[PDB]
């Protein structure tokens with residue numbers, strides 16, 4: 001698809017068998033999702049945004065679908081304001097910026 | 100141009116007669132630049148994301164150049180950790196996400 005930016009680039013994702021809304025976010029290095037249950041062990045990570053820093057849980061090799069495109073990679077879980085698909089998975093689905 | 104997402108999509112912008120590096124950020128509704136002078140009236144605004152909110156000055160009808168493309172729009176000025184080109188100006192240069 002080609003997604004214009006007149007509104008927020010919100011898309012449907014599937015993670016843990018559940019449909020959710022997430023923002024395709026080229027300003028995010030990594031993908032961050034609101035509190036939910038994911039399998040496996042997690043590792044600590046601190047991430048910095050416009051308002052400062054938050055602690056998140058880092059899960060690796062997580063299966064996730066983004067607009068029907070299958071990806072498997074790192075998903076951070078924590079108090080993000082909106083679910084964000086960041087560059088780590090945008091690259092997996094072959095997403096680019098174009099003008 | 101086509102910009103891949105293996106690294107942060109940073110570009111050079113011209114604003115208020117100054118050159119600055121900024122992040123092409125599809126997660127940002129608006130454009131925010133570190134402290135600098137801009138012409139005209141402004142009003143205060145709070146903007147929020149990861150880590151919470153910061154206070155900025157909102158300047159309207161500001162001309163910026165991004166990769167040879169002139170655009171006009173609202174520019175916020177304040178203590179942002181990274182200079183950010185948001186959707187309000189990305190649309191104007193005809194920037195889209197594609198996969």
Ligand SMILES: Cc1cccc(C)c1OCC(=O)N[C@@H](Cc1ccccc1)[C@@H](O)C(=O)N1CSC(C)(C)[C@H]1C(=O)N[C@H]1c2ccccc2C[C@H]1O
Nearest residue numbers: 027028029030047048049050126127128129131148149180
């Ligand atoms: C650096 C890093 C490492 C690992 C993992 C991650 C996720 C990561 O990125 C962190 C991050 O937050 N990145 C920022 C970009 C940024 C990087 C570094 C410092 C500050 C901002 C990006 O993802 C974003 O714009 N965001 C995210 S929350 C949001 C509401 C969707 C939106 C935002 O603030 N949006 C707000 C915004 C921003 C600028 C102007 C106006 C407005 C209004 C809101 O739309």
